[PDB]
RNA sequence: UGAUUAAUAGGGACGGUCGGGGGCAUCAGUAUUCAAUUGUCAGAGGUGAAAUUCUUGGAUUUAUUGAAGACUAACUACUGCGAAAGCAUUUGCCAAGGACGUUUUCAUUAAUCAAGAACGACCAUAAACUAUGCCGACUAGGGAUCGGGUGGUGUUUUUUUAAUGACCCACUCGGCACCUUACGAGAACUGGGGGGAGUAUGGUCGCAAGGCUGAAACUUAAAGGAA
């Protein structure tokens, strides 16, 4: 209700009407008769759904400009136990928000870790970067490894040569960590400890043994 | 726990918390003798036995004067001689508080046990 | 963990982002981010060997305005984490007495005046409970009562 | 662990709106037991149907003692019987479908609670020794 | 035929129920992958750039259709359930569990854990990684929330087919949590030396410098480094 006049001005410079319906709790954007841009209503759609997803307004009307886009990475369906899930998501946010703010700086994006999903705004190179970082953080590889690789790749992109060589000989994300392959006997574990549904009886007490 | 022990635990930590009334259920004759002798020496005030037919409740109104009650979980035997080494061993000072004994003439504090010259087993203390 | 450039950029990503590719490496950091990055690094290196009473000196701020700064800053912290927790937003974890570091902290430079936590409450928290005076030794005192060991019963009676 | 009981009242007399006789109540008890109800069901149908609060209060004694005086004593006591029939219902379901490991764990719990008051009823000897639980 | 209560200990019955508890069966969803039939035509993947790869035997895209395996998005919460590991489509069946309600029944049947018992020749895979708080026998609470119950009397409801509601307010019992409060001795899959940050070295153990190679017994080629 306080930021609404600024949404109305920011859309009326693009010729889009918009209403705020508090009796339902909705926001609609509508193409008017004077709307000469066809694809501006999709950016206004992103704008109202960002204001619903609780980004701020000055960070939200950076979506109405062409080099920017939304994304909502989905992380609810990566792992089974809630302890491991919340520890990997807090690993994504980081100690005192350091990992999240460093990723925001390196990818030029704006990230909100919320619930079991990770929203992001930003340029498209940054959006692909943050998507692979967030999904790799929900799998086991730490996000500071990806942040180190982002700093390495930034410094390799700001040199004129080395622009057509593969950078895998630079990156440390290649670690050669596949060093588990067991050689245990499976002496019982092939087919032993066969299942019954009925348990055996109990060992009775002393006074039960005397009665 | 026991059944005298938790009555004395309620009457301890309710007073340490600083309340003026404790409700303690279940009640028994051993609790009534124990509270009876400690109100004789003046560590609680009036106390009432509300009879419901299940086990009885006690409401103790208690002022400020107690700082520890309890029971002695091996109820060993004492004699009229060795009450003195026992009160010196488990009470805070020379003439500080009382040791409550289960005697042949009821439940009594140790000074009345030597005053009317009886012995018993130990039950608990109050100081 | 022993990459110094990485952890330095990680823990200085907040005031780089407050006072700004992006420039992060020294030989490229211009004024206020430079002075506070240097001050941050010198305090962090100094805290290992230097005395805790003398490494973090707070600015001499009067009572009625340091209490006012803290009250308004805690109202800002409460609004921030209450709004971000009534949304779904996951925030990084603080300890129990510490102020949460937010954008207004890094921007207003509030820790030099208000500190990281109210160390009076931290002191009277970290003190131990005053535990009366000890009375007896003849037995152990459990919730079932006073266990007097059988050696002690024989020894006394 | 919760606390939901019935509060047995402080009075131990007939409530004096009970205009009936204490003999017709015993005749009703033996009628319901002969037509085949467990003492809990006897007492609840008596409580709701014809307004006897509790038969120990209005009549002489508790209603398993009434059935023992009128020759209707239960073969196995009621608690042990109901846990027997529950344990064999779970064992029927388990022999039916053998991947209900939650039912197997519940069978373990029901069998232990069988054993506990089978032990109690054997050391009081309501039921005789060499009582095995099949 | 010939002694008590009926523990805000415990067990059992019953009543309306509650839940993403479990088992079997069934129903569904759009995705992904493959295939088939068209339509059209030179690209399509993918990357920081490329590449491997598919492609005028027509890839990718579009449309219709069919199958296979996996999963159950949004609703999804500091909420619910389970002894824990864990559990999200509908419907049915099978048993089970919980709290609540009770003027039902049994009458001490109980709590605790060493031991033990249950759960936890073929295609190959990750786990932890910044974290935290003062502990227990312990007092009041506060706002919210989930399940049950009692009362109040307004609106959504509605009526002569059988019931079953939703909301508001008070009370109450029990849960996963959260914010405060008051008061207490809180002692009697294994293998280990003892702080942090440094500083110095005629000891022990190793690495380590030379200096154009050729090229040394030979002052020796060709080719090269260096300037």
Domains and CATH numbers, chain D: 19-73 (no CATH), 74-134 (1.10.287.10)
Q: Is the Cβ–Cβ distance between D30 and D55 less than 8 Å?
A: no
Task: State both tokens at B28.
Answer: 């028994």
| Residue A2: C-alpha distances to residues A7, A20, A23, A56, B100 (Å) | 10, 11, 16, 12, 75
Give per-residue burial for B47-59: e unless 16+ CB within 10 Å, then b: beeeeeeeebebe
Distance from C-alpha of C155 to C-alpha of A162, rounded to nearest angstrom? 90
For strand E, the positions having any atom within 7 A of a protein Cβ are: 1, 4-14, 21-24, 47-50, 71, 73-74, 76-78, 82-87, 94-110, 115-120, 126-134, 137-139, 173-175, 182-188, 196-197
- CA angle (C23 as vertex; C22, C29 as ends), nearest 5: 150
Which residues of C, range 16-55, sit inside 8 Å of B by Cβ?
none
Test the A interface: residue of C11, C13, C25, C44 with most A CBs within 10 Å: C13
Q: Which of residues 7-46 of C touch strand E (CB under 7 A)?
A: none
Whole-number Å distance, CA A132 to C1' E46?
14
D50 touches strand E (CB under 7 A): no
Distance from C-alpha of B10 to C-alpha of B22, rounded to nearest angstrom? 7
Q: Is the Cβ–Cβ distance between C23 and C30 less than 8 Å?
A: yes
Q: Is the Cβ–Cβ distance between A89 and A113 less than 8 Å?
A: yes
> Which of these, C79, C20, C87, lies nearest to A119 by C-alpha position?
C87
Alpha helices, H only, chain C: 4-11, 13-18, 31-46, 52-55, 63-86, 103-108, 111-114, 119-126, 150-156
Name the β-bridge partners of B101. Answer: B108, B122
Distance from C-alpha of D22 to C-alpha of C39, rounded to nearest angstrom? 94
Which residues of A, range 30-59, sit inside 8 Å of C by Cβ?
54
Q: Which of C16, C89, C92 sits opposite A105 (nearest CB)?
A: C16
Orientation angle between helical segments A82-93 and A98-107, nearest 10 degrees: 60
Task: State both tokens at D1.
Answer: 């662990």
Resolution in A, one decimal? 3.4
- CA angle (A152 as vertex; A146, A158 as ends), nearest 5: 135
* Residue C132 sits at the chain B interface (C-beta within 8 Å): no
Specify the residue for token string 């209490």. C67
Pairing of strands B69-71, B106-109: unpaired
Q: Which of residues 148-207 of A touch strand E (CB under 7 A)?
A: 153, 157, 162-168, 177, 179-180, 195, 199-200, 202-203
Task: State both tokens at A80.
Answer: 């089974």
> Which of these, B97, B120, B94, B92, lies nearest to B108 by C-alpha position?
B120
Give per-residue burial for D21-56: e unless 16+ CB within 10 Å, then b: eeeebbebbbebbeeebebeebbeebeeeeebbbbe
Orientation angle between helical segments A124-138 and A82-93, nearest 10 degrees: 140
B88's CB contacts (< 8 A; 6+ apart) are B94
Q: Is the Cβ–Cβ distance between D25 and D52 less than 8 Å?
A: yes
Distance from C-alpha of B67 to C-alpha of B12, rounded to nearest angstrom? 7
Q: Do C10 and A54 touch (CB under 8 A)?
A: no
**How many residues in chain A?**
211
| Residue A136: C-alpha distances to residues A18, A78, A88, A173 (Å) | 38, 10, 10, 12
Q: What is the 3-state secondary structure (H, E, C) of chain A?
A: CCCHHHHHHHHHCCCEEEEEECCCCEEEEEECCCCCCCCHHHHHHHHHHHHHCCCCHHHHCCCCCCCCEEEEEECCCCCCCHHHHHHHHHHHHCHHHHHHHHHHHHHCCEEEEECCEEEEEECHHHHHHHHHHHHHHHCCCCHHHHHHHHHHHHHHHCCCCCCCCCHHHCCCCCCCCCCCCCCCCCCCCCCCCCCCCCCCCCCCCHHHHHC
C130's CB contacts (< 8 A; 6+ apart) are none
Burial class of residue A153 (count of CB atoms within 10 Å of its CB; 0-12, 13-18, 19+): middle
Q: Do C11 and A98 touch (CB under 8 A)?
A: yes
| H/E segment holding residue D83 | helix D78-96
């Amino acid at each position: 209700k306080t930021i609404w006049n600024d949404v109305t001005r920011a859309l009326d410079k693009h010729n889009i009407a918009c209403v705020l319906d508090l009796v339902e709790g909705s926001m609609t954007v509508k193409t008017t008769r004077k709307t000469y841009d066809p694809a501006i209503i999709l950016k206004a759609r992103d704008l109202i759904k960002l204001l619903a997803r609780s980004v701020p307004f000055p960070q939200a009307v950076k979506i109405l400009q062409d080099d920017m886009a939304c994304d909502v990475i989905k992380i609810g369906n990566f792992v089974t136990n809630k302890e491991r899930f919340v520890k990997r998501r807090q690993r994504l946010v980081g100690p005192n928000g350091n990992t999240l703010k460093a990723l925001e700086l390196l990818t030029k994006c704006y990230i909100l870790v919320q619930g079991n999903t990770v929203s992001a705004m930003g340029p498209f190179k940054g959006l692909k970067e943050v998507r692979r970082v967030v999904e790799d953080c929900m799998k086991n590889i730490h996000p500071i490894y990806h942040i180190k690789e982002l700093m390495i790749k930034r410094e390799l992109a700001k040199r004129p040569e080395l622009a057509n060589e593969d950078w895998s000989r630079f990156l440390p994300m290649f670690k050669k960590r596949n060093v588990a392959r067991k050689k245990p006997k499976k002496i019982r574990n092939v087919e032993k400890k066969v299942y019954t549904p009925f348990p055996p009886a109990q060992l009775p007490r002393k006074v039960d043994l005397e009665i | 726990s026991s059944v005298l022990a938790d009555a004395l635990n309620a009457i301890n930590n309710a007073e340490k918390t600083g309340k003026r009334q404790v409700l303690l259920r279940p009640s028994s004759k051993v609790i009534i003798k124990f509270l009876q002798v400690m109100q004789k020496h003046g560590y609680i005030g009036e106390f009432e036995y509300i009879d419901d037919h299940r086990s009885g409740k006690i409401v103790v109104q208690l002022n400020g004067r107690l700082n520890k009650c309890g029971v002695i979980s091996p109820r060993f035997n004492v004699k009229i001689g060795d009450i003195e080494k026992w009160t010196a061993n488990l009470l805070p000072a020379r003439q500080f508080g009382y040791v409550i004994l289960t005697t042949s003439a009821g439940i009594m504090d140790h000074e009345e046990a030597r005053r009317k010259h009886v012995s018993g087993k130990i039950l608990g203390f109050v100081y | 963990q022993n990459d110094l450039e990485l952890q330095q950029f990680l823990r200085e990503s907040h005031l780089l982002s407050a006072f700004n590719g992006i420039v992060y490496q020294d030989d490229q950091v211009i004024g206020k981010a430079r002075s506070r990055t240097l001050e941050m690094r010198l305090n962090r290196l100094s805290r290992v060997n230097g005395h805790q009473d003398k490494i973090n000196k707070l600015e001499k701020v009067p009572m009625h305005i340091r209490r006012g700064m803290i009250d308004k800053h805690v109202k800002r912290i409460k609004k921030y984490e209450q709004e971000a927790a009534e949304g779904g937003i996951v925030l990084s974890k603080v300890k129990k007495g510490q102020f949460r570091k937010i954008e207004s902290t890094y921007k207003k430079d509030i820790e030099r005046r208000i500190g990281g936590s109210i160390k009076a409450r931290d002191k009277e928290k970290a003190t131990k409970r005053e535990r009366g005076l000890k009375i007896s030794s003849v037995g152990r005192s459990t919730r079932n009562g006073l266990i007097v060991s059988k050696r002690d019963i024989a020894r006394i009676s | 662990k919760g606390i939901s009981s019935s509060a047995i009242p402080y009075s131990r007399n007939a409530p004096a709106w009970f205009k009936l006789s204490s003999e017709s109540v015993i005749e009703q008890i033996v009628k319901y037991a002969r037509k085949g109800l467990t003492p809990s069901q006897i007492g609840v149908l008596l409580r709701d149907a014809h307004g006897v609060t509790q038969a120990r209060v209005i009549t002489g004694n508790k209603i398993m003692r009434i059935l023992k005086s009128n020759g209707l004593a239960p073969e196995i006591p009621e608690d042990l019987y109901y846990l027997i029939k529950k344990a064999v219902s779970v064992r029927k379901h388990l022999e039916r479908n053998r991947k209900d490991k939650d039912a197997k764990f519940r069978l373990i719990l029901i069998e232990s609670r069988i054993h506990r008051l089978a032990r109690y009823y054997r050391t009081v000897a309501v039921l005789p020794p060499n009582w095995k639980y099949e």
